[PDB]
Design a protein around this nucleic acid. Structure first.
Ligand SMILES: [Mg+2]
Ligand SMILES: [Mg+2]
Ligand SMILES: [Mg+2]
Ligand SMILES: [Mg+2]
Ligand SMILES: [Mg+2]
Ligand SMILES: [Mg+2]
Ligand SMILES: [Mg+2]
Ligand SMILES: [Mg+2]
Ligand SMILES: [Mg+2]
Ligand SMILES: [Mg+2]
Ligand SMILES: [Mg+2]
Ligand SMILES: [Mg+2]
Ligand SMILES: [Mg+2]
Ligand SMILES: [Mg+2]
Ligand SMILES: [Mg+2]
Ligand SMILES: [Mg+2]
Ligand SMILES: [Mg+2]
Ligand SMILES: [Mg+2]
Ligand SMILES: [Mg+2]
Ligand SMILES: [Mg+2]
Ligand SMILES: [Mg+2]
Ligand SMILES: [Mg+2]
Ligand SMILES: [Mg+2]
Ligand SMILES: [Mg+2]
Ligand SMILES: [Mg+2]
Ligand SMILES: [Mg+2]
Ligand SMILES: [Mg+2]
Ligand SMILES: [Mg+2]
Ligand SMILES: [Mg+2]
Ligand SMILES: [Mg+2]
Ligand SMILES: [Mg+2]
Ligand SMILES: [Mg+2]
Ligand SMILES: [Mg+2]
Ligand SMILES: [Mg+2]
Ligand SMILES: [Mg+2]
Ligand SMILES: [Mg+2]
Ligand SMILES: [Mg+2]
Ligand SMILES: [Mg+2]
Ligand SMILES: [Mg+2]
Ligand SMILES: [Mg+2]
Ligand SMILES: [Mg+2]
Ligand SMILES: [Mg+2]
Ligand SMILES: [Mg+2]
Ligand SMILES: [Mg+2]
Ligand SMILES: [Mg+2]
Ligand SMILES: [Mg+2]
Ligand SMILES: [Mg+2]
Ligand SMILES: [Mg+2]
Ligand SMILES: [Mg+2]
Ligand SMILES: [Mg+2]
Ligand SMILES: [Mg+2]
Ligand SMILES: [Mg+2]
Ligand SMILES: [Mg+2]
Ligand SMILES: [Mg+2]
Ligand SMILES: [Mg+2]
Ligand SMILES: [Mg+2]
Ligand SMILES: [Mg+2]
Ligand SMILES: [Mg+2]
Ligand SMILES: [Mg+2]
Ligand SMILES: [Mg+2]
Ligand SMILES: [Mg+2]
Ligand SMILES: [Mg+2]
Ligand SMILES: [Mg+2]
Ligand SMILES: [Mg+2]
Ligand SMILES: [Mg+2]
Ligand SMILES: [Mg+2]
Ligand SMILES: [Mg+2]
Ligand SMILES: [Mg+2]
Ligand SMILES: [Mg+2]
Ligand SMILES: [Mg+2]
Ligand SMILES: [Mg+2]
Ligand SMILES: [Mg+2]
Ligand SMILES: [Mg+2]
Ligand SMILES: [Mg+2]
Ligand SMILES: [Mg+2]
Ligand SMILES: [Mg+2]
Ligand SMILES: [Mg+2]
Ligand SMILES: [Mg+2]
Ligand SMILES: [Mg+2]
Ligand SMILES: [Mg+2]
Ligand SMILES: [Mg+2]
Ligand SMILES: [Mg+2]
Ligand SMILES: [Mg+2]
Ligand SMILES: [Mg+2]
Ligand SMILES: [Mg+2]
Ligand SMILES: [Mg+2]
Ligand SMILES: [Mg+2]
Ligand SMILES: [Mg+2]
Ligand SMILES: [Mg+2]
Ligand SMILES: [Mg+2]
Ligand SMILES: [Mg+2]
Ligand SMILES: [Mg+2]
Ligand SMILES: [Mg+2]
Ligand SMILES: [Mg+2]
Ligand SMILES: [Mg+2]
Ligand SMILES: [Mg+2]
Ligand SMILES: [Mg+2]
Ligand SMILES: [Mg+2]
Ligand SMILES: [Mg+2]
Ligand SMILES: [Mg+2]
Ligand SMILES: [Mg+2]
Ligand SMILES: [Mg+2]
Ligand SMILES: [Mg+2]
Ligand SMILES: [Mg+2]
Ligand SMILES: [Mg+2]
Ligand SMILES: [Mg+2]
Ligand SMILES: [Mg+2]
Ligand SMILES: [Mg+2]
Ligand SMILES: [Mg+2]
Ligand SMILES: [Mg+2]
Ligand SMILES: [Mg+2]
Ligand SMILES: [Mg+2]
Ligand SMILES: [Mg+2]
Ligand SMILES: [Mg+2]
Ligand SMILES: [Mg+2]
Ligand SMILES: [Mg+2]
Ligand SMILES: [Mg+2]
Ligand SMILES: [Mg+2]
Ligand SMILES: [Mg+2]
Ligand SMILES: [Mg+2]
Ligand SMILES: [Mg+2]
Ligand SMILES: [Mg+2]
Ligand SMILES: [Mg+2]
Ligand SMILES: [Mg+2]
Ligand SMILES: [Mg+2]
Ligand SMILES: [Mg+2]
Ligand SMILES: [Mg+2]
Ligand SMILES: [Mg+2]
Ligand SMILES: [Mg+2]
Ligand SMILES: [Mg+2]
Ligand SMILES: [Mg+2]
Ligand SMILES: [Mg+2]
Ligand SMILES: [Mg+2]
Ligand SMILES: [Mg+2]
Ligand SMILES: [Mg+2]
Ligand SMILES: [Mg+2]
Ligand SMILES: [Mg+2]
Ligand SMILES: [Mg+2]
Ligand SMILES: [Mg+2]
Ligand SMILES: [Mg+2]
Ligand SMILES: [Mg+2]
Ligand SMILES: [Mg+2]
Ligand SMILES: [Mg+2]
Ligand SMILES: [Mg+2]
Ligand SMILES: [Mg+2]
Ligand SMILES: [Mg+2]
Ligand SMILES: [Mg+2]
Ligand SMILES: [Mg+2]
Ligand SMILES: [Mg+2]
Ligand SMILES: [Mg+2]
Ligand SMILES: [Mg+2]
Ligand SMILES: [Mg+2]
Ligand SMILES: [Mg+2]
Ligand SMILES: [Mg+2]
Ligand SMILES: [Mg+2]
Ligand SMILES: [Mg+2]
Ligand SMILES: [Mg+2]
Ligand SMILES: [Mg+2]
Ligand SMILES: [Mg+2]
Ligand SMILES: [Mg+2]
Ligand SMILES: [Mg+2]
Ligand SMILES: [Mg+2]
Ligand SMILES: [Mg+2]
Ligand SMILES: [Mg+2]
Ligand SMILES: [Mg+2]
Ligand SMILES: [Mg+2]
Ligand SMILES: [Mg+2]
Ligand SMILES: [Mg+2]
Ligand SMILES: [Mg+2]
Ligand SMILES: [Mg+2]
Ligand SMILES: [Mg+2]
Ligand SMILES: [Mg+2]
Ligand SMILES: [Mg+2]
Ligand SMILES: [Mg+2]
Ligand SMILES: [Mg+2]
Ligand SMILES: [Mg+2]
Ligand SMILES: [Mg+2]
Ligand SMILES: [Mg+2]
Ligand SMILES: [Mg+2]
Ligand SMILES: [Mg+2]
Ligand SMILES: [Mg+2]
Ligand SMILES: [Mg+2]
Ligand SMILES: [Mg+2]
Ligand SMILES: [Mg+2]
Ligand SMILES: [Mg+2]
Ligand SMILES: [Mg+2]
Ligand SMILES: [Mg+2]
Ligand SMILES: [Mg+2]
Ligand SMILES: [Mg+2]
Ligand SMILES: [Mg+2]
Ligand SMILES: [Mg+2]
Ligand SMILES: [Mg+2]
Ligand SMILES: [Mg+2]
Ligand SMILES: [Mg+2]
Ligand SMILES: [Mg+2]
Ligand SMILES: [Mg+2]
Ligand SMILES: [Mg+2]
Ligand SMILES: [Mg+2]
Ligand SMILES: [Mg+2]
Ligand SMILES: [Mg+2]
Ligand SMILES: [Mg+2]
Ligand SMILES: [Mg+2]
Ligand SMILES: [Mg+2]
Ligand SMILES: [Mg+2]
Ligand SMILES: [Mg+2]
Ligand SMILES: [Mg+2]
Ligand SMILES: [Mg+2]
Ligand SMILES: [Mg+2]
Ligand SMILES: [Mg+2]
Ligand SMILES: [Mg+2]
Ligand SMILES: [Mg+2]
Ligand SMILES: [Mg+2]
Ligand SMILES: [Mg+2]
Ligand SMILES: [Mg+2]
Ligand SMILES: [Mg+2]
Ligand SMILES: [Mg+2]
Ligand SMILES: [Mg+2]
Ligand SMILES: [Mg+2]
Ligand SMILES: [Mg+2]
Ligand SMILES: [Mg+2]
Ligand SMILES: [Mg+2]
Ligand SMILES: [Mg+2]
Ligand SMILES: [Mg+2]
Ligand SMILES: [Mg+2]
Ligand SMILES: [Mg+2]
Ligand SMILES: [Mg+2]
Ligand SMILES: [Mg+2]
Ligand SMILES: [Mg+2]
Ligand SMILES: [Mg+2]
Ligand SMILES: [Mg+2]
Ligand SMILES: [Mg+2]
Ligand SMILES: [Mg+2]
Lengths: 97, 147
RNA sequence: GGGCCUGACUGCGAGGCCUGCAAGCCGAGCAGGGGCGAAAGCCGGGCCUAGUGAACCGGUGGUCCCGUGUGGAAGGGCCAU
RNA sequence: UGGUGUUGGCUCUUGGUCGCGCCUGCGUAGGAUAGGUGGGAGCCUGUGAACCCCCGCCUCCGGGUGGGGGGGAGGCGCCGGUGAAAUACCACCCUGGCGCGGCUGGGGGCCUAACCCUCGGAUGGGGGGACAGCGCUUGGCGGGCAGUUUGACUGGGGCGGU
RNA sequence: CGUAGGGUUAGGCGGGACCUAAGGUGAAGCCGAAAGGCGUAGCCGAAGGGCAGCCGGUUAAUAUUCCGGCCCUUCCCGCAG
RNA sequence: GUAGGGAAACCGAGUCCGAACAGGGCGCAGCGGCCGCAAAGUCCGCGGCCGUGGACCCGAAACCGGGCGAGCUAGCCCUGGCCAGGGUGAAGCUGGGGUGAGACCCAGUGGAGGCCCGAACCGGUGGGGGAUGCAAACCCCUCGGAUGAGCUGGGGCUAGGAGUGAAAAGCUAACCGAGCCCGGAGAUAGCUGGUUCUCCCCGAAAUGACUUUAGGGUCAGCCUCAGGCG
RNA sequence: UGGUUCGUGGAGCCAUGGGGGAAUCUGGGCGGACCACCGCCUAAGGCUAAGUACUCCGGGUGACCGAUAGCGCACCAGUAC
RNA sequence: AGCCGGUAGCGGGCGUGGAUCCCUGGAUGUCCGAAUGGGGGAACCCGGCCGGCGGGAACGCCGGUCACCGCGCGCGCGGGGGGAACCUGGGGAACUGAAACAUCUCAGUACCCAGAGGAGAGGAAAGAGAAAUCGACUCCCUGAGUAGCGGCGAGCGA
């Protein structure tokens, strides 16, 4: 319920629009709005744990950008990552974005 | 999802083959256990350039062995021994033929490859396969003679 | 009471009644195509006064007026309900 | 609460669909049980015949069709009976059914590795487990809360009446 | 009360250079559009724990604080065991 | 502004409805002896009144946003403190009795309890006083609890549709059925009030219709001013 | 869902939380559903003066005020209270 | 050619060898504050390390230095906080109006928050939209209360 670390996808505000009535195209009198109230639409945030340079790195990422994580690992094969901490590996992974 | 198998897995495919499986299978079983790699375009050339290079080293064996099948099959290794009538007092071994094909005719050869279980204990004219590479077996004519 | 019928018209409408508005009401006459009558003529529902509901939004039939570069189409307008 | 994403493996079982083997098709008339349109004036037998009997299957009650054995070489069409179409043989497809497969819909069972819980030990063990949680979406219940509405005349107002 | 001058003296009294309580804060970590919310340790947090001074005299005004008497604590250095 | 008519296509001093060349709707138009001159229309000034805006001025009860408050009060948490004196005399214990052993009875010991009387302390029952008070809750007399669900110091946490409540919609800083401050903000008020020099001419209405209208409005009626008619 | 004049409307365009998910100019997006024709334009990387806004500050100028006015404050005022 | 602020006085001084005073630069600048050694009830308290001072080891004082985060190959550069309005972005009411009220309006306004700078934003066409046309963006005038949107109501408005 926050921020995709790969895409930057963020919780956005949306309206919930309650309607009644038969649509004009169905031959009806037309749609009437019985209510409009704000709500939030969240990214489909999921945990993705991967191993890089021996250490275990966790990403909080929207489902839409899950393959972008595994790509970052392949692109991380050509980096001097050995011996760094997980916090340091993550920064190097995201730097390759 | 397309992947490149690193190993032959039952009813899945052969090593180095590009198969298509479900995302979760590849992400939470195969790729973590080293059983397959993502069929990305980048390492899809890595696969291709191994298929390429491995075929190159092999056809270089089948065309270096062929040149060694030209020198042999077009000569005869005459071997002089001490022999009584037909039985030899000593024996001519594959090692002997090799060390014979050295000093004579110039070609050094691998003894352990020649097809000869027991040492030759009689005179005559023998036809001995070499096999420096399968499907390329060199027939060598070796003539055991006395004195 | 009976005969033939569909004027329980279409296109209009001088002139008025009533009246704050918007409505309601009466209407001769002209044309189109008719009904009845020999004809003069009558006929635009019903002896009369109640039996009703402005807009908006939408349905249906027709019209073929608009059609977002152009031809169409979507969707509207108009007449009728 | 349905669909769907995160969400995967194996199997069994029913469903649907194509691929393939296929086999199934019953009037009067007409050999007999004629799926249809073409191709068709021939195919078939040491890829052993007319037929004797044991085996499943299909039986509109004739059979049909699949094996096996004996024997081991002739049998059906073209003709005509014949019907709307009429026959050996070769394709395309039609009915329905079955089997091996695709590819998926449900269902049952099991797995583990996502995900969740846990364990002085943690690139691990244990438990749950593709469920639950969570994201998008569907319909529902919903004074827990929120915004409001709840007409006028009237011998005051309400009540009644209008 | 107005103006001015003077008056509050501590190693031992109370607080701090000690400790922890609720609670607050908060490396690690978790969460949230932003602001921020949480959070084991640790830190802060007292009138609780801990810790060595009694009696008398003196000033216009301070006194376990100055003075007198008799005591005591910690730190540093050194000596001896 | 110089062209209008039609939903429009379009036509145009016409156009629209229509079969119409019918009828109707809406449209189409200076004075003198070329010039003055008066004029479409238009520009600017000025004045009346209307629309928009807080719109003549002052006034709500309220609604919303962001902060500020538990030094009062409510509850809890941590850590300390306090409760004279007297009375009642549970269990247990011991001894005696009792019995097959017991139950149990009696005396002594004992010291329990949202036990009793009563100060401190915590309350606030009835009456009187007070009522521009000593006091925006006080005073006198009386009265309830006073080892407990007791009282109290210090240190803390919980708050506004929220807290806390042995529950009274009580309390959350002397007015709480939704705190306070600042902001939206000059909210809105068809209601009440108020509206400031002088003189001159005219001079009403309180009806009708309709109205979630009835003490408010739109139109008409009635008043007034300018132009015109006569 | 939002933005736009567009409140579901025939609803395109621009943006995007969810699902699916391409191509490299013979590719692609747009001209208000959609299709054809004809044109326009090159998304998914970034930067870029000037013309524009404001007035704590400085100056200049008022058919602006003149101590109940003009800033809340002409004065020791964000003060006393 | 006077001067030691408002500020006179007391008691003392300074200036044509150029004072006071005005401008520019520099020096000094206690303690708190982003506040940053640590703590904290701002302006107080308590430390480590190196150097100095005292008879100085205990004690105290003086100078230097020591927060956290980001970025780069232990050392560097950067960040933090503030500013009257103005700006952009992320969130975002209600009274009110519709003579009731819910869609709608008030309004993407008030306000909160993040960031920016002397401005900010936008900006070099996957534009416009019918001109066989134009040629980044910003801003003013106009187009125009037009086109349209709208319980086709109130209103909104390119
Ligand atoms: Mg919804
Ligand atoms: Mg519709
Ligand atoms: Mg339609
Ligand atoms: Mg609607
Ligand atoms: Mg998650
Ligand atoms: Mg995962
Ligand atoms: Mg998506
Ligand atoms: Mg996807
Ligand atoms: Mg009659
Ligand atoms: Mg009759
Ligand atoms: Mg007739
Ligand atoms: Mg008339
Ligand atoms: Mg009338
Ligand atoms: Mg009537
Ligand atoms: Mg009528
Ligand atoms: Mg006639
Ligand atoms: Mg006639
Ligand atoms: Mg006639
Ligand atoms: Mg006749
Ligand atoms: Mg006639
Ligand atoms: Mg007539
Ligand atoms: Mg009648
Ligand atoms: Mg009659
Ligand atoms: Mg009648
Ligand atoms: Mg109507
Ligand atoms: Mg309406
Ligand atoms: Mg309509
Ligand atoms: Mg039509
Ligand atoms: Mg047309
Ligand atoms: Mg068109
Ligand atoms: Mg065409
Ligand atoms: Mg056309
Ligand atoms: Mg057509
Ligand atoms: Mg049409
Ligand atoms: Mg009609
Ligand atoms: Mg659901
Ligand atoms: Mg799923
Ligand atoms: Mg299981
Ligand atoms: Mg398991
Ligand atoms: Mg497990
Ligand atoms: Mg289990
Ligand atoms: Mg699930
Ligand atoms: Mg759905
Ligand atoms: Mg729902
Ligand atoms: Mg309800
Ligand atoms: Mg309610
Ligand atoms: Mg309201
Ligand atoms: Mg109502
Ligand atoms: Mg009602
Ligand atoms: Mg009502
Ligand atoms: Mg009433
Ligand atoms: Mg009455
Ligand atoms: Mg009456
Ligand atoms: Mg009365
Ligand atoms: Mg009365
Ligand atoms: Mg009633
Ligand atoms: Mg005094
Ligand atoms: Mg003195
Ligand atoms: Mg002393
Ligand atoms: Mg001490
Ligand atoms: Mg010390
Ligand atoms: Mg301390
Ligand atoms: Mg401590
Ligand atoms: Mg952190
Ligand atoms: Mg915290
Ligand atoms: Mg804690
Ligand atoms: Mg400490
Ligand atoms: Mg402490
Ligand atoms: Mg203490
Ligand atoms: Mg103590
Ligand atoms: Mg002490
Ligand atoms: Mg002592
Ligand atoms: Mg003295
Ligand atoms: Mg004294
Ligand atoms: Mg003294
Ligand atoms: Mg002493
Ligand atoms: Mg020693
Ligand atoms: Mg017109
Ligand atoms: Mg006419
Ligand atoms: Mg017409
Ligand atoms: Mg006329
Ligand atoms: Mg003139
Ligand atoms: Mg004029
Ligand atoms: Mg007016
Ligand atoms: Mg206003
Ligand atoms: Mg006003
Ligand atoms: Mg006005
Ligand atoms: Mg309200
Ligand atoms: Mg309300
Ligand atoms: Mg409310
Ligand atoms: Mg608040
Ligand atoms: Mg208190
Ligand atoms: Mg309290
Ligand atoms: Mg305690
Ligand atoms: Mg206690
Ligand atoms: Mg206590
Ligand atoms: Mg007591
Ligand atoms: Mg007692
Ligand atoms: Mg007692
Ligand atoms: Mg006692
Ligand atoms: Mg006793
Ligand atoms: Mg006892
Ligand atoms: Mg006893
Ligand atoms: Mg006893
Ligand atoms: Mg007692
Ligand atoms: Mg006693
Ligand atoms: Mg009690
Ligand atoms: Mg008691
Ligand atoms: Mg008692
Ligand atoms: Mg006492
Ligand atoms: Mg009390
Ligand atoms: Mg008290
Ligand atoms: Mg009291
Ligand atoms: Mg009480
Ligand atoms: Mg009393
Ligand atoms: Mg009494
Ligand atoms: Mg009393
Ligand atoms: Mg008395
Ligand atoms: Mg009284
Ligand atoms: Mg009294
Ligand atoms: Mg009183
Ligand atoms: Mg009293
Ligand atoms: Mg008393
Ligand atoms: Mg008493
Ligand atoms: Mg008493
Ligand atoms: Mg009692
Ligand atoms: Mg008592
Ligand atoms: Mg007592
Ligand atoms: Mg008692
Ligand atoms: Mg107690
Ligand atoms: Mg207490
Ligand atoms: Mg307390
Ligand atoms: Mg306190
Ligand atoms: Mg609480
Ligand atoms: Mg609170
Ligand atoms: Mg608060
Ligand atoms: Mg409130
Ligand atoms: Mg509030
Ligand atoms: Mg409520
Ligand atoms: Mg509540
Ligand atoms: Mg209570
Ligand atoms: Mg207050
Ligand atoms: Mg109160
Ligand atoms: Mg009260
Ligand atoms: Mg109030
Ligand atoms: Mg309220
Ligand atoms: Mg409220
Ligand atoms: Mg209060
Ligand atoms: Mg404020
Ligand atoms: Mg306002
Ligand atoms: Mg007001
Ligand atoms: Mg109101
Ligand atoms: Mg006035
Ligand atoms: Mg008069
Ligand atoms: Mg009247
Ligand atoms: Mg009316
Ligand atoms: Mg009515
Ligand atoms: Mg009425
Ligand atoms: Mg009324
Ligand atoms: Mg009345
Ligand atoms: Mg009224
Ligand atoms: Mg009037
Ligand atoms: Mg008159
Ligand atoms: Mg008049
Ligand atoms: Mg006149
Ligand atoms: Mg969409
Ligand atoms: Mg919208
Ligand atoms: Mg529409
Ligand atoms: Mg749209
Ligand atoms: Mg829309
Ligand atoms: Mg799109
Ligand atoms: Mg998206
Ligand atoms: Mg192209
Ligand atoms: Mg293309
Ligand atoms: Mg596009
Ligand atoms: Mg398009
Ligand atoms: Mg375009
Ligand atoms: Mg188009
Ligand atoms: Mg373009
Ligand atoms: Mg490009
Ligand atoms: Mg830019
Ligand atoms: Mg320039
Ligand atoms: Mg600039
Ligand atoms: Mg600029
Ligand atoms: Mg300027
Ligand atoms: Mg100025
Ligand atoms: Mg003046
Ligand atoms: Mg003056
Ligand atoms: Mg004054
Ligand atoms: Mg003043
Ligand atoms: Mg004066
Ligand atoms: Mg000033
Ligand atoms: Mg003032
Ligand atoms: Mg003043
Ligand atoms: Mg003052
Ligand atoms: Mg002075
Ligand atoms: Mg002097
Ligand atoms: Mg002097
Ligand atoms: Mg000089
Ligand atoms: Mg300076
Ligand atoms: Mg100093
Ligand atoms: Mg400082
Ligand atoms: Mg500090
Ligand atoms: Mg600190
Ligand atoms: Mg030192
Ligand atoms: Mg020293
Ligand atoms: Mg220092
Ligand atoms: Mg230091
Ligand atoms: Mg900041
Ligand atoms: Mg800033
Ligand atoms: Mg800044
Ligand atoms: Mg914004
Ligand atoms: Mg942001
Ligand atoms: Mg927003
Ligand atoms: Mg904003
Ligand atoms: Mg809100
Ligand atoms: Mg509202
Ligand atoms: Mg308002
Ligand atoms: Mg209005
Ligand atoms: Mg308004
Ligand atoms: Mg209203
Ligand atoms: Mg109203
Ligand atoms: Mg109301
Ligand atoms: Mg409203
Ligand atoms: Mg709006
Ligand atoms: Mg503002
Ligand atoms: Mg500039
Ligand atoms: Mg810029
Ligand atoms: Mg470019
Ligand atoms: Mg114009
Ligand atoms: Mg708007
Ligand atoms: Mg404009």
């Amino acid at each position: 319920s926050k921020v995709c670390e790969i895409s930057g996808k963020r919780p956005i505000v949306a309206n919930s629009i309650q309607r009644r009535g038969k649509a004009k195209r169905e031959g009806g009198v037309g749609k009437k709005t019985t209510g409009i109230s704000k709500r939030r639409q969240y990214p489909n945030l999921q945990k993705v744990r991967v191993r890089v340079a021996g250490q275990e790195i966790t990403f909080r990422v929207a489902a839409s950008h899950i393959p972008k994580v595994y790509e970052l690992v392949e692109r991380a094969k050509g980096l001097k990552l050995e011996g760094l901490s997980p916090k340091e590996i993550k920064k190097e992974l995201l730097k390759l974005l | 999802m397309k992947v490149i198998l690193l190993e032959p897995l039952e009813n899945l495919g052969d090593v180095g083959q590009v198969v298509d499986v479900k995302p979760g299978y590849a992400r939470n079983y195969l790729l973590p256990r080293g059983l397959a790699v993502l069929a990305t375009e980048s390492n899809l050339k890595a696969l291709e350039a191994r298929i390429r290079a491995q075929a190159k080293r092999l056809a270089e064996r089948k065309a270096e062995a062929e040149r060694l099948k030209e020198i042999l099959e077009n000569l005869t290794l005459t071997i002089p021994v001490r022999a009584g009538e037909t039985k030899i007092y000593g024996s001519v071994t594959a090692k002997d033929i090799a060390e014979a094909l050295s000093r004579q005719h110039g070609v050094t050869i691998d003894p352990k490859r020649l097809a000869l279980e027991k040492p030759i204990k009689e005179l005559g004219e023998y036809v001995l396969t070499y096999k420096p590479h399968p499907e390329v077996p060199i027939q060598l004519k070796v003539s055991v003679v006395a004195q």
